[PDB]
Amino acid sequence: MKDKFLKHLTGPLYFSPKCSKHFHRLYHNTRDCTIPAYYKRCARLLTRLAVSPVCME
C-alpha cells in the first residue's frame, strides 16, 4: 500500500550498494517519495537512478 504502489509504476529495478545508498536518500529524504500525492515524481526519480551511471556498473 506504501511501497508496492511505487513498484507498480517503476518496475522491479536492480541496485548496487552505492545505488542503494542513493536510493535510501531518494526514498526517505525527498518530498517526492515522502508525499503520497507526488508518487509519480518519486517513480521517475527511481527510474532515473536505475539508468544512472553509478548503478550501471
Binding site: 550498494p17 542503494s20 545508498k21 542513493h22 535510501h24 536518500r25 531518494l26 526517505h28 529524504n29 525527498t30 518530498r31 517526492d32 515522502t34 509519480k40 515524481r41 521517475r44 526519480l45 532515473r48 537512478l49 539508468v51 544512472s52 551511471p53 553509478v54
Partner: protein, 346 residues
C-alpha cells in the same frame, strides 16, 4: 530544530518567459513560514531573495522546469532536473533563488488557425516536409525550453552559484520518439557557464554569458528571461512558443534549449524533429552533492530548503526520520540489521 520545518519556493503563480512579481510571491506565500523579496527591475527581476533564519547545515533541493511540448501532444515533455545539495549557511545570509518556469507548449493555441494544426485538421507543415524535406515557411510548433532553477549568493558583488537544476529542452514539432539524454552535472566552477547553441530555435541560457539573439534564453546574470519564438513562426502565423523563465530557449519548428549552468543546445537548422537539449546542472564546491542529478519535474521548477538531519552520531552516516512521529532511524546497508544500541549494524 523542528524536523518538519521546511521552506518551499515556487514560481509564485508566474508562468512563461518572465518571473513573478512581489505581489505574486506575497500572495503565494500568504499564511506560510516563508517571506521573500522579489526584485522589480534589472537583471535581478523575478528572483526571490530569502534570509537564512539560523546558521546551520541546510539541505537545498533544486528542481528545474520541464520543457514545452511539440505540435502533437502525444510525446511526453522533457522533464526538469533535480539536484540535491548540502550547504553550511550563516544567519542573515541572503539566498537568491530563481525558480525556473516551464517552457511553453505548442498546443493548444488560442489562435484558431494554429489550433487547426494542433488537432490535425491542417497539414501545411506535413506537405512542406513532403515537398522540401525542410521547414522554411511554415516554421513553428516546437516547445520552448524549460527554465533552470538557480540558488546562489552575492559574495562581494560577484554572484556565486550554489545549486543549479537544469531545465528541460523543448520537444520538436515532429518528435517521433521519447528518448532522453543522461543528466549532465557540473561541479567545477572553472568551467564557463555559457549559453547553448542557437539555430532556428533558441539555445538555453547559461549562468554567465552575453545573449544577443531574441529567441535564445538569457543567461542568469543578464536576467534569465526566456527567449522569444523564431521570427519566421511569428511572421507566418504568430505561433509563439517562448522559453521558460530561467534561461529557457525560445521555440521554432525545432525545440528550444533548456536553461542551466550551461544552456542546452538547439538544432543548427530548423529541423522539425530535433528536440532541444536540457541544460547542464551545477553543484557548488562549497556544498556536498546529496543525490545525483535526475530528471523529475513535469511542470514548473521549485526549491525546497530544510535543516539537514545531522547523522554522524551513528556508525552509518546515512539516516532518516520516521514519518509516524518517531525518532531518527539510522539505516543499514546490504542485509545488516540495526543493533539494540541503535547506532551500529549487525
Amino acid at each position: 530544530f523542528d524536523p518538519t520545518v521546511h521552506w518551499l519556493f515556487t514560481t509564485c503563480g508566474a508562468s512563461g518567459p518572465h518571473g513573478p512579481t512581489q505581489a505574486q510571491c506575497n500572495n503565494a506565500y500568504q499564511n506560510s513560514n516563508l517571506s521573500v523579496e522579489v526584485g522589480s527591475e534589472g537583471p535581478l527581476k523575478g528572483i526571490q531573495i530569502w534570509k537564512v533564519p539560523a546558521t546551520d547545515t541546510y539541505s537545498i533541493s533544486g528542481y528545474g522546469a520541464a520543457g514545452g511540448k511539440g505540435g502533437k501532444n502525444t510525446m511526453m515533455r522533457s522533464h526538469g532536473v533535480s539536484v540535491l545539495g548540502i550547504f553550511n549557511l550563516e544567519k542573515d545570509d541572503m539566498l537568491y533563488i530563481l525558480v525556473g518556469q516551464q517552457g511553453e507548449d505548442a498546443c493548444p493555441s488560442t489562435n484558431q488557425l494554429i489550433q487547426k494544426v494542433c488537432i490535425g485538421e491542417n497539414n501545411v507543415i506535413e506537405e512542406e516536409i513532403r515537398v522540401n524535406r525542410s521547414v522554411h515557411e511554415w516554421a513553428g510548433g516546437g516547445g520552448g525550453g524549460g527554465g533552470a532553477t538557480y540558488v546562489f549568493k552575492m559574495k562581494d558583488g560577484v554572484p556565486v552559484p550554489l545549486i543549479i537544476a537544469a531545465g528541460g529542452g523543448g520537444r520538436a514539432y515532429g518528435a517521433k520518439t521519447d528518448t532522453f539524454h543522461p543528466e549532465r552535472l557540473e561541479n567545477n566552477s572553472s568551467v564557463l557557464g555559457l549559453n547553448g547553441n542557437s539555430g532556428a530555435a533558441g539555445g538555453g541560457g547559461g549562468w554567465n554569458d552575453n545573449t544577443s539573439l531574441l529567441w535564445a534564453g538569457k543567461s542568469l546574470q543578464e536576467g534569465a528571461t526566456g527567449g522569444h519564438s523564431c521570427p519566421q513562426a511569428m511572421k507566418k502565423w504568430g505561433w509563439e512558443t517562448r522559453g521558460g523563465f530561467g534561461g529557457g530557449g525560445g521555440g521554432c519548428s525545432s525545440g528550444g534549449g533548456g536553461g542551466g549552468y550551461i544552456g542546452g543546445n538547439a538544432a543548427s537548422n530548423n529541423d522539425p524533429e530535433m528536440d532541444g537539449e536540457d541544460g547542464v546542472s551545477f553543484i557548488s564546491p562549497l556544498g556536498i552533492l546529496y543525490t545525483p542529478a535526475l530528471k523529475v519535474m513535469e511542470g514548473h521548477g521549485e526549491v525546497n530548503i530544510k535543516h539537514y538531519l545531522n547523522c554522524s552520531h551513528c556508525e552509518v552516516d546515512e539516516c532518516h526520520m520516521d514519518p509516524e512521529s518517531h525518532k531518527v532511524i539510522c539505516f543499514c546497508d546490504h542485509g545488516t540489521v540495526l543493533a539494540e544500541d541503535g547506532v551500529s549494524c549487525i
